[PDB]
Design a protein around this ligand. Structure first.
Ligand SMILES: NC(=O)c1ccc[n+]([C@@H]2O[C@H](COP(=O)([O-])OP(=O)(O)OC[C@H]3O[C@@H](n4cnc5c(N)ncnc54)[C@H](O)[C@@H]3O)[C@@H](O)[C@H]2O)c1
Ligand SMILES: NC(=O)c1ccc[n+]([C@@H]2O[C@H](COP(=O)([O-])OP(=O)(O)OC[C@H]3O[C@@H](n4cnc5c(N)ncnc54)[C@H](O)[C@@H]3O)[C@@H](O)[C@H]2O)c1
Lengths: 350, 350
């Protein structure tokens, strides 16, 4: 295992995408979503996803040159057809539009059609926050999580991402799957041979299990009150599938192979709020400032620490700014054969 | 204990409010919110709240004749100043506005100022659903729930309510506090002398306890992953307080006495979506129909049943339509003295 510079990894991912014969904007957008994940420590959706995207692109699943267009739209809303684009491209574009509409109507909501996996949901949410708007991001995926008291994979890990501008620091940022823990976690624990935390997954009968080998579905967030987490996965499902026209979780094709050619037709939803359309920006920042000052200063349990959403990510982000992002041996090896294959320089390490 | 007709209770609540010298619209709005809770089985926020509202009105906390006005607003947004109105009046009014803005811009968002406790958050969300829009409702309250790993009451029970139109049945409705369970639950368990479920509350040290007498704060939804529940309470806090200009949870005055004269200045947020602004309503209903058809038909655990958000509320709602709402002896006795006091007919029983 070893470290890599965030620019070294960035320039590398973009170089590879271009080599696959991808759009210049599709390459920039796809690398931002992965650099976002890698910079914020959410490595499950970091640069390790490069391998998959190039396979989906070469396979035909992801369109190299997507023509993003608005099928309709009136007022502060509009539905966009990404043209089977790479999730990040389809959603980064949808958000710049939602921000544009928010600048004109105080708010902006955009339904996304014919898209794909977009990596970390917070990428787009954090984009709006960096711009001074409140960004929302919903989406679904192939069924993985059961309902409360369920005995089958029902909803996808249907994430929720909310980004709020700060003042003189990093934006408030929530990026979470509606299930207790994401799916890659069971694969990781299965790989290490360790048991999962209690109430994160269930067997085929709907009864929880801490054995990663017996898991056949993820459990909703909330535990005994998991029905609340299942309900949250419902709101995202409505904004991501019923309101976009795309297929529901249980109707979507697998995220993995063997098919890397037939498009999945994934739906998503983006939302932006213009703080200045409701109140004085000076009173918004002082409230947010006070809100965060108090939160972080709040009493904690024994040897514990309290933090706002995004605080853990800004701590690792700062560390990866100077120290660099860790790249294990097997992902590094994948970077070498990708570099060999596409004739691009591999990331320098240390 | 005995039963009461939903019209008998409805007419009674309205009668009492008018007797206190309240607005005609403030009486209708306040009785709908309570009738909503009583009809849907969420009795914690039903007609048992009458006793408190008349006390807040007579005390001077709640304005009997509120002048709801929009301080500003451009595009599909606007901030409304309820003029210290009863919660239901301030929010039912803000929702009809958000619906009005949604009919014109596809969406409608309204920031509510100088409001008060509005009973069940689903009342307003369900209103938009009955109207054919997708309604959202956010609000905070005085601190009761701790942060993940916290050792102090931080957020209020900050509820989330989302109502989505169905097709040929009752709307999809989510109404849930961000905390695992609402506060009144500790009072009930303390009253019965029984222990609470694991992970719903904590003592003064931030460590969970099932003893309702040792509880000093509620726990976020999610358990070990309660940080997601605390992050959700954060999004509502931002929409309900930082975005409205109203006080944050920890700055708000108590919901109970002894002060029933000084206004709390509670904030809230309302949102409305016009499905027709994104797609053909015929494809929205067929997707929602299929979504619910499959959900309810999904496989369940041993002797369990799966249901969508609101399904449990529509089962008791139907039961309370014909059979009637149960009223215990002590709440009925409060109705008798309220009837005696204001010279209004008490609900007929059976
Ligand atoms: N593209 C897709 O289809 C898809 C689907 C599912 C998940 N994802 C991604 O998976 C990634 C991980 O999701 P997750 O739910 O496992 O993340 P997580 O459970 O690790 O954390 C989610 C949230 O809780 C916060 N948090 C964690 N610990 C905390 C603490 N101690 N105190 C306060 N807050 C704390 C985090 O900042 C974060 O906002 C996300 O980036 C998500 O977008 C993507
Ligand atoms: N006015 C305020 O300031 C305020 C503050 C907090 C809470 N409240 C009110 O408290 C009331 C109760 O909130 P709560 O969170 O305790 O309710 P709850 O936990 O009983 O239920 C919330 C949700 O989960 C769903 N649900 C329950 N069991 C289910 C199952 N088996 N399968 C699928 N779904 C299921 C319910 O339909 C509901 O939408 C709400 O009406 C809320 O608005 C008001």
């Amino acid at each position: 295992t070893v470290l890599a510079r965030l620019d070294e990894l960035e320039r590398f991912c973009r170089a590879v995408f271009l080599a696959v014969g991808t759009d210049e904007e599709t390459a920039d957008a796809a690398t931002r979503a992965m650099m976002h994940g890698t910079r914020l420590g959410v490595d499950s959706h970091g640069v390790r996803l490069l391998a998959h995207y190039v396979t989906a692109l070469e396979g035909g699943r992801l369109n190299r040159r997507p023509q993003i267009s608005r099928v309709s739209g009136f007022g502060a809303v509009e539905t966009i057809d990404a043209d089977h684009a790479h999730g990040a491209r389809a959603t980064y574009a949808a958000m710049e539009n939602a921000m544009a509409l928010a600048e004109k109507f105080g708010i902006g909501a955009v339904a996304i059609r014919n898209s794909s996996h977009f990596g970390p949901a917070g990428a787009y949410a954090l984009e709006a926050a960096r711009q001074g708007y409140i960004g929302l991001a919903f989406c679904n995926s192939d069924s993985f999580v059961r309902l409360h008291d369920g005995a089958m994979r029902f909803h996808g890990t249907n994430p929720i991402a909310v980004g709020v501008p700060a003042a003189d620091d990093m934006p408030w940022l929530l990026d979470m799957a509606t299930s207790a823990v994401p799916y890659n976690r069971v694969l990781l624990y299965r790989s290490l041979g360790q048991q999962l935390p209690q109430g994160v997954a269930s067997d085929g009968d709907g009864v929880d299990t801490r054995d990663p080998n017996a898991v056949e579905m993820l459990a909703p967030v909330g535990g005994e009150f998991g029905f609340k987490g299942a309900a949250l996965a419902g709101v995202v499902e409505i904004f991501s599938a019923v309101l976009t026209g795309m297929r529901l979780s249980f109707d979507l094709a697998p995220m993995g192979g063997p098919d890397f050619s037939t498009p999945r037709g994934l739906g998503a939803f983006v939302l932006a709020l213009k703080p200045e359309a409701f109140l004085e920006r000076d009173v918004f920042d002082e409230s947010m400032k006070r809100y965060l000052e108090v939160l972080r200063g709040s009493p904690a349990r024994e040897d514990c620490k309290v933090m706002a959403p995004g605080d853990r990510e800004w701590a690792v982000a700062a560390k990866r700014e100077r120290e660099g992002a860790p790249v294990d041996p097997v992902t590094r090896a994948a970077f070498s054969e990708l570099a060999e294959k596409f004739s691009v320089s591999p990331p320098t390490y240390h």
